[PDB]
Amino acid sequence: LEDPYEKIGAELVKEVAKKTTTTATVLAQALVREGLRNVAAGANPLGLKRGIEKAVEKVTETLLKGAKEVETKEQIAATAAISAGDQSIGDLIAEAMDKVGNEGVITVEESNTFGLQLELTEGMRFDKGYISGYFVTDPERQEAVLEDPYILLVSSKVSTVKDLLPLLEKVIGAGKPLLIIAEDVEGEALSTLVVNKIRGTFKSVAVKAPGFGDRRKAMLQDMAILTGGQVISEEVGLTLENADLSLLGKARKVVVTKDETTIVEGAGDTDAIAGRVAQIRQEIENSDSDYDREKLQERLAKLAGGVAVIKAGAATEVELKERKHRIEDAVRNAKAAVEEGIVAGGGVTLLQAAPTLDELKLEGDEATGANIVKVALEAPLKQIAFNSGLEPGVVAEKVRNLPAGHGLNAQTGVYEDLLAAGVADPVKVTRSALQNAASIAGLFLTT
Amino acid sequence: LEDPYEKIGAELVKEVAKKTDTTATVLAQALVREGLRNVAAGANPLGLKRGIEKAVEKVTETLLKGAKEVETKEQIAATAAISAGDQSIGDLIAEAMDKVGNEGVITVEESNTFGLQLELTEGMRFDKGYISGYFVTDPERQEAVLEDPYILLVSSKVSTVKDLLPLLEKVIGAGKPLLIIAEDVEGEALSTLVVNKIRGTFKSVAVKAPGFGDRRKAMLQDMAILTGGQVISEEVGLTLENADLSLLGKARKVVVTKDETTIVEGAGDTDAIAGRVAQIRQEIENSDSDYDREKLQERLAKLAGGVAVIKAGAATEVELKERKHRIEDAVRNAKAAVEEGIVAGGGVTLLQAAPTLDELKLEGDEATGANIVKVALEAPLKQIAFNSGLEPGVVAEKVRNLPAGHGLNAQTGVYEDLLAAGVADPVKVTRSALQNAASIAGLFLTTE
Ligand SMILES: [Mg+2]
C-alpha cells in the first residue's frame, strides 16, 4: 500500500537522480518521501531543507573521520581487487599506481597478445575533450583515437582555411592522422576538419588548448617539448601558412574523450623533456606566490609523471570490451579510495552513521529536516535487504545493533564484517551519493 | 599689448582649468575674455552664457557628424600610436584590444623587463573604489595597490572589530595583504583596518560590493569563482568565526582607485570559471526580462573577458612612471576613438565647425553668446601657430578656409591633409574639451 501522491514524487525523483546511481536515488526518494510527509503537516519547505543540509554536512564529517585509509600498494591492490573481482587485476593497478603515483594517467589498451601486461611511457592528459563529437570513432565509448598522430600546436584560434590547407596537404601526403590543439577551432576550419573526416579523406580531432592566456601558451610549449614540435604562433616568425612536418610533434596514440585528451608517447628528446622538467622545478623554487607553484607543480606532474598503460589480451572483441571496462572501473575506484579512503559498503556505514545526528542541537523545522536525513540514512540498506528478499524493518534492526563495520552481505547472506568480506566502498562515493540525494531532495521540497 | 585685467583673468581661468580634465583651457580663456569684453559693453551675463550653451550643442552634433569611424585593428592601432608617441605601443594596444575585446579591461603596470609586455590573465574590474582614501598606497595616483592578496568576500556589512580577528589573525600570519569586499565596512571595523594600514601592521583595502540585494549577492559569487574564494554568508556558508584561509580567494594583484576595483590574475580554477560563465549564458536564455538580460550579459562579459596586462619596458627610472601614464592615456584614448570616431587634429576640426553656428536663432544677447563661441573655436589652432612662431590671424585665416579636412602641422609646416598626415583627436576628446570650457565660462559670467 503505497500512497499515490508519494509514488508520483518517487518517480519524479528517480527520473532526476538518473541524470545526476542506486544509492543516491534510494537515498533521495527517502528524503523527499519524509519531506512531503512533513510539508503536509504544516512545515516550512525551506526550514526542512536547511535542516537536511546541516545533517548532511555533519554525517559527511563523521563518514570522513571513520574511514579506513588506503595507502600501501598492498591495500590499494586489495581495493582494486574487489572493484574488478580479480586479484590479478588489482595488483597490476596497484603496480601502475605505485609507478606513476596515485594521481597519474593510467590508460588501458587493447593488446593483441593475451594476458595482462604493464608498460610505462611518456605523455600526459589534460581536461579538454574534442571540439565536435563528430570527431568520434568508437561510438560506444564516445572516444576518438588517433594512431601514430601528427600533433599541431597553435597559440591562437584557427578558423580560416587559407593557412590550414598548406599544412593539411603536407600531412595527408604522409598518410598520418592529426591532432590539433589550438586556442580554438572555429567553423570553416572546424567543418573542413569534421567533413574530410567523414569523407574518410582525413582522420583527426581538434581540442581546445588548456588554460587561459599566458599559462595557456606555456602548456602548449610544454606539449611541443613533450611531442617534439614547435608551437605555431605567427607572432614569433612561425607561420601556420608555412610549416613543414618538421614543426609537428609525433606520438604513438592519442585519445580524446568528451573532456580529456591523452597523448601517449614522445615526442621530443629525453634531454629537452628533462630540461623543461628542471626549469619548472626552478620556477617552483624561485616563487613565493603559492598560486604559480600550484599551477607549476601541475605542469610538472603531467610533464614528469608520464603515462602507465595497462594492456589486456582477449579473443572476443566483446571480452576485450568487458575487460577494458572492468579495469577502467577498478582504476577510478582505486584512485577514489586513495583520497577520502574506504568504508564498509552494503549501505551499512550510512545506516550506522545515524546516531551521530544526536550530537546536533536544532529546533523545529531544521530539526525535523535533520531527523528526516536520520531516517533516510537507512534507506540504502533497507532497500538492499528487500531485493535480498529479507525483511527491511527486521534487517534495519539487526544491523542498527552490530559492530561498526558489520552488516548484511547479500553475496553470502552472512552477517559479518563487510570490510573483511570485501564488501566495501570508496568513501568519496558514499559521501557524493548523500550530497546529491540531498540537493535533489532539497530542490524538490522547494520547487 | 596684454591687458592687466584680461591677464589677471586669463590667469584665473588657467587655474580653474587645472581642476578636472590643454585644448579646453585655451577655449575657456577665449570664451571668458571675449565674454568679459562683451559684458563690459552692456551685454548681460546670463544672456551670453545661455547663448554659449546652445551654441555649444550645435557644435556638438556637428562634430559627432564629421566623425571618421574606427573599427579595424589597423585604424585603432594607428590612433593609439599617436596618443602614445610610439607605434610599438599603438599595435600593442590594438592587439590588446583584439584579445580581451574593445571595451574590456586593459591594465598597465611598470615591469622591469625591457620589451613592453602583453600578458593576458583571468580577472575583473568593477565600478566601486575604496570605502576610504586612507587605503591609498600610491598617493600620486590616488591608488591602493595590493600584491598577492587574500581576498575576502562578505555578503553582509562588516563593522564589528571582533568578527574579523580570527581571520585577520590568520592573514597577518602569512604576511599577505587583504582585500575585503563586503556590503560595507564601517565603524570600528573600518577604522581598525585603516589604522593598521598606516602603521604597517597589516596591509588592506576595503571595497563595497556592487549593485543591490540579490544581484549584488550574485556578483560576489562571481568574484568568488574568479578568485578561488567562497562568499562568507550567514545563509549558506558559515560564520566569520573559525573560517579557513581556503575560504579566501587570491590574485596576483588588486588595484583599487577612487572609482574602481581591478582584480588581476584571479586564482580560480579556469574550468570552474568557464562553468559559471556557462551557468550565466543559460540564465540569459531562460530570462523573462530584457532588463534582467542586459545585467546578466555584462556579468558574463566580466568573467569570460579576463584582463589584458601591459608591462612597461623599464630601465630605468622615473621614465617608468611617465611611460606608464602615457600607455594608459593611449588606451582610454583608443577606447574613445572607436566609441565616437576621429576628426581633424590640430586646432582644425574645431575651427571649421563655426560655420555650423549660423543655422541657429541669432537673437539678442544669446545671439552674441554664440558669437563668442564661434570666436573661441579659433583659439585652439591660434595657440599652435603661436608656437612655431607664426601669425595667428594669418595661419588662422588660411586654415579657416582650407577645404574641409585640411590644416597646418607642427613638425610639418604643411597645410596638408592632417588626418592622413597622422595628426588627429578622438571626437569625444574634442567634444569634451569644448563642453568643459563652456562650463568654466559658465561660471565667470554668473559669478564673481
Ligand atoms: Mg604597478
Coordinates of C-alpha atoms and ligand atoms in Angstrom, one line a residue, chain B residues 108-110 143 145 147 253 255 324, ligand 1:
Chain B
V108 CA 49.3 48.9 -17.3
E109 CA 52.0 48.1 -14.8
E110 CA 55.6 49.1 -14.7
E143 CA 45.5 54.3 -5.6
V145 CA 47.8 48.6 -4.9
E147 CA 50.5 42.5 -4.2
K253 CA 47.4 41.9 -7.8
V255 CA 44.2 47.8 -8.0
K324 CA 53.0 54.1 -17.7
Ligands
MG1 MG 52.0 48.9 -10.6

